[PDB]
Amino acid sequence: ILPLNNIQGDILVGMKKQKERFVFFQVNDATSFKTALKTYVPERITSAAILISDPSQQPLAFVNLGFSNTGLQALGITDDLGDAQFPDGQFADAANLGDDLSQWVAPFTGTTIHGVFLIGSDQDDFLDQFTDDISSTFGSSITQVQALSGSARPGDQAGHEHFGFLDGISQPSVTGWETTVFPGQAVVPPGIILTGRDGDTGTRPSWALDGSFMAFRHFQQKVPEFNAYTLANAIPANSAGNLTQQEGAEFLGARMFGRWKSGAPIDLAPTADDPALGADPQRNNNFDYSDTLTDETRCPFGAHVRKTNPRQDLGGPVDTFHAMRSSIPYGPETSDAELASGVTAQDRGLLFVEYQSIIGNGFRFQQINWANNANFPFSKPITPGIEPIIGQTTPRTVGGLDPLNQNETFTVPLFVIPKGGEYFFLPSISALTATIAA
Ligand code: HEM
Ligand SMILES: *[C@@H]1O[C@H](CO)[C@@H](O)[C@H](O)[C@H]1NC(C)=O
Ligand SMILES: COc1cccc(OC)c1O
Ligand SMILES: COc1cccc(OC)c1O
């Protein structure tokens, strides 16, 4: 049984708050930081247990805390955590991910960042109150080098990311606790997500039990450009009949993602949106590509969700490459004038968060081995190509987007720009005080 009171809640349950702030910091004084941390943790650090408690018993803000390798070093915590990528940091790994390094910005361009406080709350003012509480408690023991703040989109776009698609539908379920499991949801041993638990194969210090590694990515999105691209390349028809340009553009977007904007998976709804299905957690994940392993009519081989979770393209259930996501959009809505121009005029995007016990098996495997690999999934009659949303290999050519002309290739401009990121370790709540602050 997992000790839910000891696991940082964003890892297992997800904050699911309307607003979130990532406060990136450096440690200035290890001794002063450690005593501040011992004060802070029992008061503010939110467990999985709290996140599944009655909302009345919940605090106004949830706080979680992760450390980079240099943060652990600054604190004299020098035990090897057993991950191949964590020690060097993400900037050193960015070229491997396919990133254009010229688009990276401070303070991510190095290993200056020692950690991140994640604050989830209902309003920006509450984020400010909890940020000020960090300032008051830690004082000059830290320097806040950057804060990145996000917000759920308004109205019926709540839960949707900036291109318009419902995000946060498909997550693995870990064994070791009692929770609801939906049809089609992968059930994995807890060590796929939690370091030191069954299923983890990395060599972990005992104090690393029930922690997890976060891959953080700051993505800027080019929404008018995406919209204009789908209009310019609108699919003329599908199996059900001819499409108006607007229908064909919406369909092309769905083909790129593998889901309609509503969340309806195209493997179940291959020709038209089914918003009732999109909003149905009991059915919106109940598919595995077994009905489309050797053709692309129902779903392209290279659609976002199929690349990042290949399901039956792997030949059966595989524990190893599942990961939890707790991303949040940021920035203003895209104006009518922006969409008309087809050109981005404001900074908006995704503060992307993915948790796994082995960075190389979760985020990094999904990115490099799968999304960036034109020849993945394997053994297909048409080359899948590069995942159109986040695949980084050039040329960004993907096949099969038009179900009636599957050999047609699309060369897709990059609409998602990495601006920085880092690899963090989130310890257990007890480890925060018993180890990190010792
Ligand atoms: C701005 C960039 C991105 C956007 C807009 C985006 C959007 C989405 C959307 C709309 C979904 C479908 C709903 C869901 O299952 O949650 C999804 C699923 C998913 N995405 Fe992304 N994503 C982005 C980047 C990434 C990256 C960089 C990765 C990992 C390398 C990733 C991994 C996944 C995974 C694992 C799923 C669930 C797949 C499944 O289990 O079927 N995404 N994403
Ligand atoms: C469908 O679209 C084609 C052009 O792509 C057109 O020739 C045809 O008349 C349309 N309608 C039907 C019912 O086939
Ligand atoms: C329906 O869900 C699945 C089926 C088969 C394999 C999966 O992950 C590799 C998976 O997530
Ligand atoms: C019928 O399915 C196929 C036919 C020809 C080649 C294939 O992959 C190499 C394939 O999967």
- Which of 97, 99, 162, 305 maximizes ligand 1 atoms within 8 Å of its Cβ, making it the mutation to test the pocket? 305
Q: Which residues contact 299 (CB under 8 A, 6 or more apart)?
A: 255, 258, 265, 266, 267, 270, 289, 292, 306
Q: Residues 6 or more apart from 210 whose CB is under 8 A from it?
A: 2, 3, 6, 7, 194, 195, 196, 197, 428, 431
Amino acid at 108: F
Calculate how far, in angstroms, residue 167's C-alpha sits from the geometric centre of ligand 1.
7
Cα-only R_g, the chain: 21
Q: Is 288 a catalytic residue?
A: no
Q: Residue 183: CB within 6 Å of ligand 3?
A: no
Q: How many angstroms separate the alpha carbon of residue 132 from the centre of ligand 2?
A: 62
Final resolution, Å: 1.4
Pocket of ligand 1 (CB under 6 A): 161, 163, 165, 167-170, 217, 219, 221, 257, 259, 304-305, 308-309, 350, 352, 354, 363, 366-367, 389-390, 416
User: Which atom of ligand 1 is found nearest the CA of 160?
Assistant: 10
Span from the CA of 229 to the centroid of ligand 3 (angstroms): 31
Q: Name which residue sits closest to atom 12 of ligand 1, judged by CA.
A: 167
Ligand 1 centre to CA of 119 (Å) is: 22
Q: Whose CA is nearest to atom 11 of ligand 2?
A: 242
242 lines ligand 2 (CB under 6 A): yes
3-class SS string, the chain = CCCHHHCEHHHHCCCCCCEEEEEEEEECCHHHHHHHHHHHHHHHECEHHHHCCCHHHCCCEEEEEEECHHHHHHCCCCCCCCCCCHHHCCHHHHHHHCCCHHHCCCCCCCCCCCEEEEEEECCHHHHHHHHHHHHHHHHHHEEEEEEEEEECCCHHHCCECCCCCECCCCCCEECCCCCCCCCCCCEECHHHCCCCCCCCCCCCCHHHCCCEEEEEEEEEECHHHHHHHHHHCCCCEECCEECCHHHHHHHHHHHHHCECCCCCECCCCCCCCCHHHHCCCCCCCCCCCCCCCCCCCCCCCCCHHHHHCCHHHHCCCCCCCCCEECCEEECCCCCHHHHHHCCCCCCCEEEEEEEECCHHHCHHHHHHHHHCCCCCCCCCCCCCECCCCCCCCCCCEEECCCCCCCCCEEECCCCEEEEEEEEEEECCHHHHHHHHCC
| Ligand that comes closest to the CA of residue 234 | 2
Residue 380's region, left for phi above 0, alpha for psi from -120 to 50, else beta, is beta
The ligand minimizing its distance to the Cα of 244 is: 2
Distance from Cα 242 to the centre of ligand 2, integer Å:
6
The experimental method behind these coordinates is X-ray
Question: Which residue puts its alpha carbon closest to atom 8 of ligand 3?
Answer: 311
Q: Which two tokens stand for residue 261?
A: 């904007």
What's the 154 CA to ligand 3 centre distance in angstroms?
32
Residue list, annotated binding site for heme b: 168-170, 259, 304, 309, 311, 325
In this structure, the residue with its CA closest to atom 2 of ligand 2 is 242
Query: Which of 309, 356, 378 best tests ligand 3's pocket when mutated (most atoms within 8 Å of CB)?
Result: 309
Mutate to test the pocket of ligand 2, among 242, 244, 247, 404 (most ligand atoms within 8 A of CB): 242
Assigned token pair, 266:
């195209």
CB 334 within 8 A of CB 193: no
Catalytic entry in 10, 99, 167, 273? 167
